[PDB]
Every structure is written in C-alpha cells, then in structure tokens.
C-alpha cells in the first residue's frame, strides 16, 4: 500500500539494552536527540560543525583557514583549505608518541595459529624504513605507487609509507589479471610497484610475482619492483629492477620524517568500474578524506581507542582502504588484517578470529553471511563476549539474513549497522550510528553528519519532497570525504557525478525514503552490477567477450542471485559457426578471466543468433 513498499509493516528495533550494560566505555553520543542536534548543525552550519569535528579528530601541522570552498555544480570543492598535515602522522606517529606498545595491527595469517601483533612503535618503524626504500629508489611527493598485495600487514605498511612521503598509492586488488594491473599502472603512470612473491589465501597459492612480471612487460616506466617474500617460492627475478623488501629495509633507519602535505594534496587513487568506459581512478585527497574516515569510525562504528576492529573487506577495495586501514588507525585502536577466507580451514574461521582476538566490531558483506548461514549454525559456537557492533556493507542486509546476524551471530547483544556508501563518497553516508540509531531490517536508516540526501524524479530530475517517496538518490551538498576527481579526466568526473543533475551529487543508486524518513537503497540505475561484493561494469565484461575472435556482439546484464546478490549473465552473437559450442563457452569464460579476473567471469555465456 505505501510508495516505498519495502518498508510496509517494518517497525524499528531499538539498540539492545545489554549493549549499554556491557559497554567498556559509553557511546560518543547521548542518544538520538544529540544525533539530531549535531546532524542539523552539520547541514545548517557545516563551516562550524566540520571545523570542530576536524580539529577534534585530526592533528594538523598547520591549522586550516576555511572549512570549505567551492560548490557541487562547480566541481571545485576543497575542504580545510590552508591546512597542512600528514596521514601517516595521524595514523601512526601521534599514537606511537603516546602509547608505543599499544597493539596497532593484529595479523591473522591464512593458516590459523600463525600471524602476529604489531605495536604502534613497530608500525612506525616499518612504515619509516619502507618509505626510506621508496625515497632511495627515487619516489617523490606526488608520484603514484602501484600496490599489488594480499591481506598482510605489509599492505598497511605500504599504504602508509606512500602517505608518509606524499606519494599517491594506487592499490590494485590482488585478484586482478595482469591486463587489469597493467591498465591501472599505465593510467596512474606509476614508476614503482610493491608486490609479493606469492599470496596464500584459503590454502591456495596466488602467483603474484608472475602476474606482475607479465604486466610490467608493457609498463616500461616502472623501474623498480619491491617484492615481499611471503612464501619463499622460487619466482622469476629481474636483476636491476626487482628488489627484496627484507633486504632493502635492513639498509635504512627505523624513523623517517613525514612529508608536509596540503589538505588537498592527493592521498590515493582507487580504480573503480563505472557505467561507461574503462575503470576510473577515483582520487581522494588528504584532510577531508581522513576527517570522514575518523568521524565515521567514531560515530558509526562506536570506536574507542581500546577497541579491536575487524573489517573483512580487502585492501583492494574502498572498504579496506577506509575501515581496515585509515579509520581505526586514525582513532588509535587495533585493526585486524585477515589473510584467509571465512571458509578456511572451516566455516568457523570468522568466529575463531573474533573470539581469539576479543574483537569488538566486525564489518562484513552480506554475501559472506549468506554463505555462512547456508553452511549451518553448528559452525558458530563462540562466546565472542566483546562483540558489540555488527556492520554490513555492499547491499541491503535482508530480513532473513538480518535476523540471523542479529540472533545467531550477535546473540541479540550487538547492534547491526547497515552502512550505505561507495568508493566516491570516501566513508559512510547513510547508516545507523552504532549504539544510537533504531534500525529497520533492510534499511540503511538515516544520513550521516553532513549528508543531505534528496530523492529526484529520474526523468525530470525534480526533487520529490516529503516522505514515502521513491526515485534517484542524490546529495544536495558537498561533504568532506567526497572524491575530488577522476585521475586525468576531470571532465568525466564532472559528467558522471555533477552534470547529470546540476546542483546535486548523483550516486547512481535508486532509493526510497519511507514514512519515517528512513532510506531504502534499491541499487544501481546504471550498468553497474554488484556481484559477491565486486562492483562490475557490464560494459567492461562485454568488451572482454568481444576480444574473442568468434564473438561479434555481446550483451551482459545483472540478475538477482540468492547467494552472490546478483549474477552477471552474458549473451554473445557469433561471427560464424562453432561446432565446439560447449567448448567455446569455456574459452569465453577464460577470456573474461584474462581480461579482468576470475571474479568477473559470467556464470554462463549464451551463444545466440541475434
């Protein structure tokens, strides 16, 4: 009967009472009244609200002159202008100064019972001497550095060492093919790459150095490749280009100065798939991105310095950027770097890790939850006494999965926080606040501070006022962690995000706002599909399928899937005939695996006449 049909007869759920009784500290907010007061200030007077938030959470070398200049339509937004700071100083130095022996990183290795814990002082040493390696090899402020690493603590060392010297890290998910790594390394114009000899995940060997070698044959500007010895396997070696991480860092001091950066110096590039064209290098700058990361870590995930935060996302994606690395380290707590899968050695692994390390917040994709729920509740039998926040990201956590997460995983003692955001927003933008916001199963709830959502008519672009409305999700105002450009193509950034509905930021998602103002995310309205947590471009996959000599035309679509959220399905029209039609279906799948990576392979390729 309502316009937003998903909300029909869905009541809110309060934060469990025991959450407050068992809390080691207390929430950073007194309740929803204070959220509403701070939220209104963040919209009505963002100059005052964000200046105080930034000065609360981020240590500047030089205080900023003005909170924000520019406009959405101008595509000229700048935050904390005139400030100077360094991201590695805020993630590492200031904490090592105060509490050097506090654990910063818990490394959980692919095999249980391995791994190690890393203090803030140890982190400062490893970041410093890795930064010395890059500096000695000629990396300078403003250079991009390609990173092709699995989930080991050396990945955090690498991001933060780039930030320490003002280089711009460009992390490439270690499941990408050599073609995909090559394309991102070329576009970023990186001259330095960091990788492993091999990766280990779920007991399986990933031949990272071999993949890198293949990519670098076509990246002539890459003059050094720093290799971390993860497995010790014999790998191909290029004298004069390749260097061993362990050999190089032993040469250099255990401390390096931090480079003084402008608030608006680029911090990183993250190549992201869009509705049209090759992946775009989404650029985040420094102060605004860090402010958003710290602000959401604090108020969304209820992070306090003593906490042990565990995000299951990969450093290759924005979730790992913001919530494995930047947010928890900015706030000075402990973060978990998890090398394995939730199924290795068995389906208990996530809970084994949470129980061993006394994790307080866990951040998961619903695809992983559905896999585990299907495996059966006998794999979950873990006290997990400290687990009080259960975050979810990537798609709506639907009622059946929500209930399982709340009751079986959380024992009705944790607050489930469904966080809506995207690579381009830097940090959470519509989400409940942990320990504060009442929630609805399947809803992202309410906007974060500084986020002013509107629902637009898809055709006319007109704003649809009031509640129980549906349409396009857009934001009316800039926010600190917004992506600042697409690398090398500001015009595409303008045309993609800011020129579609002038005066607004276009998310590419549909949404409903229900009778109580709660937001229900409908998903992408463009040709972007989200498959097992992977943001994929159907146009990219079609182009991959066309690379096959038999295929003339290709069409790929995303369809609902009970486990992967959505499944990509591909249709091809052949140029002639193929008596090995079942055999062609294998070559087409391998073609996508070569062009993009295993994770992008279509479930099936249908060969049709027209």
Ligand X SMILES: CCCOP(=O)(O)OC[C@H]1O[C@@H](n2cnc3c(N)ncnc32)[C@H](O)[C@@H]1O
Binding residue for ligand X (CB under 6 A) from 192, 301, 347, 421?
A: 421
Structure tokens at 482: 């917004």
Least separation in angstroms between residue 360's CB and ligand X is 21
Of 429 and 592, which CB lies nearer to ligand X in the complex structure?
429
Burial 300-325 (b: 16+ CB within 10 A, else e): bbbbbeebbbbbbbbbbbbbbbbbbb
Rounded to whole angstroms, the Cα distance separating 74 from 63 reads 25
Write out the DSSP string of 7-49.
Answer: GTT---BPPPHHHHHS-SS--SSSSHHHHHHHHHHHHH-HHHH
Write out the DSSP string of 44-81.
Answer: H-HHHHHHHHHHHH---SB--SEEEE--TTTT--EEEE
Q: Are 519 and 420 in contact (CB under 8 A)?
A: yes
Structure tokens at 274: 């869009």
What sign has the CA pseudo-torsion 234, 175, 194, 124? negative
Binding part of the chain for ligand X, among 105-113, 293-301, 520-528, 596-604 by CB under 6 A, reads: 520-528
Does 595 help bind ligand X (rule: CB under 6 A)? no
Does 540 help bind ligand X (rule: CB under 6 A)? no
Positions in 467-486 near ligand X (CB under 6 A): none
Does 444 help bind ligand X (rule: CB under 6 A)? yes
363 is in an annotated binding site: yes
Could you check whether the bond before residue 462 is cis, i.e. omega within 30 degrees of 0?
A: no
The CA R_g of the chain, rounded to the nearest whole Å, is 23
Structure tokens at 420: 């809506």
Does 530 help bind ligand X (rule: CB under 6 A)? yes
Of 263 and 335, which CB lies nearer to ligand X in the complex structure?
335
Does 423 help bind ligand X (rule: CB under 6 A)? yes
Binding part of the chain for ligand X, among 66-74, 174-182, 389-397, 457-465 by CB under 6 A, reads: 389-397
Number of neighbouring beta carbons within 10 Å of residue 608: 10
Residues pairing with 168 in the sheet? 144
Least separation in angstroms between residue 562's CB and ligand X is 17
Does 271 help bind ligand X (rule: CB under 6 A)? no
Least separation in angstroms between residue 392's CB and ligand X is 7
Positions in 310-329 near ligand X (CB under 6 A): 318-319
For residue 267, what are the contacts with CB-CB under 8 A and spacing of at least 6?
A: 87, 163, 168, 169, 284, 285, 286, 289, 290
Does 275 help bind ligand X (rule: CB under 6 A)? no
230 is in an annotated binding site: no
Of 169 and 548, which CB lies nearer to ligand X in the complex structure?
169
Least separation in angstroms between residue 336's CB and ligand X is 18
Does 419 help bind ligand X (rule: CB under 6 A)? yes
Binding part of the chain for ligand X, among 185-193, 408-416, 518-526, 544-552 by CB under 6 A, reads: 518-526
Does 171 help bind ligand X (rule: CB under 6 A)? no
Of 339 and 418, which CB lies nearer to ligand X in the complex structure?
418
Least separation in angstroms between residue 397's CB and ligand X is 7
314 is in an annotated binding site: yes
Structure tokens at 158: 């690498």
Binding residue for ligand X (CB under 6 A) from 379, 535, 548, 569?
A: 535
Q: Are 413 and 19 in contact (CB under 8 A)?
A: yes
Q: Within the chain, what is the greatest distance between any pair of CA atoms?
A: 70
Positions in 491-510 near ligand X (CB under 6 A): 507-509
Query: Which of the 8 DSSP states describes residue 90?
Result: I
Binding part of the chain for ligand X, among 84-92, 130-138, 369-377, 519-527 by CB under 6 A, reads: 519-527
Q: Are 178 and 207 in contact (CB under 8 A)?
A: no
* Consecutive H or E run containing 458: none
Give the residue numbers of the binding site for CoA.
201, 314, 363, 532, 593
Question: What is the binding site for ligand X (CB under 6 A)?
Answer: 272, 318-319, 393-396, 418-423, 444, 507-509, 521, 523-524, 530, 535
């Amino acid at each position: 009967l309502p316009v937003v049909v998903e909300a029909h007869q869905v009541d809110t759920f309060d934060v469990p009472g025991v959450f407050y009784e068992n809390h080691p500290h207390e929430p950073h907010l007194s309740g929803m009244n204070e959220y509403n007061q701070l939220y209104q200030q963040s919209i009505n007077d963002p100059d005052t609200f964000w200046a105080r938030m930034a000065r609360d959470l981020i240590t500047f070398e030089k205080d900023f002159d003005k909170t924000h200049i520019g406009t959405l339509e101008g595509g000229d937004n700048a935050w904390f202008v005139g400030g100077r700071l360094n991201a590695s100083f805020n993630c590492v130095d200031r904490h090592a100064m105060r509490d050097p022996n506090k654990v910063a990183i818990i490394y959980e290795a692919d095999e249980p019972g391995h791994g190690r814990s890393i203090t803030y002082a140890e982190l400062l040493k490893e970041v410093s001497r890795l930064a010395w390696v890059m500096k000695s090899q000629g990396v300078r402020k403003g250079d991009t550095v390609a990173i092709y690493l699995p989930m080991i603590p050396e990945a955090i060392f690498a991001l933060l060492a780039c930030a320490r010297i003002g280089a711009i890290h460009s992390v490439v998910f270690a499941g990408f093919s050599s073609d995909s790594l090559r394309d991102r390394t070329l576009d970023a114009r990186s001259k330095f790459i960091i990788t492993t000899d091999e990766g280990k995940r779920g007991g399986k060997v990933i031949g990272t150095k071999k993949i890198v070698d293949e990519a670098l044959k076509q990246c002539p500007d890459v003059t050094n490749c720093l290799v971390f010895k993860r497995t010790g396997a014999d790998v191909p070696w290029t004298k004069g280009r390749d260097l061993w991480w362990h050999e190089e860092v032993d040469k250099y001091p255990n401390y390096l100065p931090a480079e003084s950066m402008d608030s608006e110096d680029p911090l990183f590039l993250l190549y992201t798939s869009g509705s049209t064209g090759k992946p775009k290098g989404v650029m985040h700058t420094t102060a605004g991105y860090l402010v958003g990361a710290a602000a959401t870590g604090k108020y969304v995930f209820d992070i306090h310095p003593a906490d042990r935060f565990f995000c299951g996302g990969d450093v290759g994606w924005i979730t790992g950027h913001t919530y494995v690395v930047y947010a928890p380290l900015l706030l000075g707590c402990t973060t978990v770097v998890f090398e394995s899968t939730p199924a290795y050695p068995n389906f208990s692994r996530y809970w084994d890790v949470i129980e061993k390390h006394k994790v307080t917040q866990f951040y998961v994709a619903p695809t992983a939850l559905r896999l585990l729920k299907r495996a059966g509740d006998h794999h979950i039998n873990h006290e997990m006494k400290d687990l009080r926040i259960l975050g979810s990201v990537g798609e709506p956590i639907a009622a059946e999965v929500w209930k399982w997460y709340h009751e079986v995983v959380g024992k009705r003692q944790a607050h489930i926080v469904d966080t809506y955001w995207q690579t381009e927003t830097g940090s959470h933008v519509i989400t409940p606040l942990g320990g504060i916001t009442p929630t609805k199963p399947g809803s992202a709830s309410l906007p974060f501070f500084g986020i002013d959502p509107v629902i637009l008519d898809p055709v006319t672009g007109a704003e649809i006022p009031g509640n129980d409305v549906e349409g396009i999700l857009a934001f009316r105002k800039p926010w600190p962690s917004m992506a600042r450009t697409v690398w090398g193509d500001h015009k595409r950034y303008m045309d993609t995000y800011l020129n579609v509905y002038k005066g607004f930021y276009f998310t590419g998602d549909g949404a409903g706002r229900d009778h109580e103002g709660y937001y229900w995310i409908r998903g992408r309205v463009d040709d972007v599909v989200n498959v097992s947590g992977h943001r994929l471009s159907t146009a990219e996959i079609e182009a991959a399928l066309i690379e096959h000599h038999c295929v003339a035309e290709a069409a790929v679509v995303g369809v609902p899937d009970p486990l992967t959220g959505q499944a990509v399905h591909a249709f091809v029209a052949l140029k002639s005939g193929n008596d090995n039609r079942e055999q062609l279906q294998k070559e087409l799948i391998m073609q996508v695996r070569k062009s993009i990576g295993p994770f992008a392979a279509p479930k099936v390729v249908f060969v049709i006449d027209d």
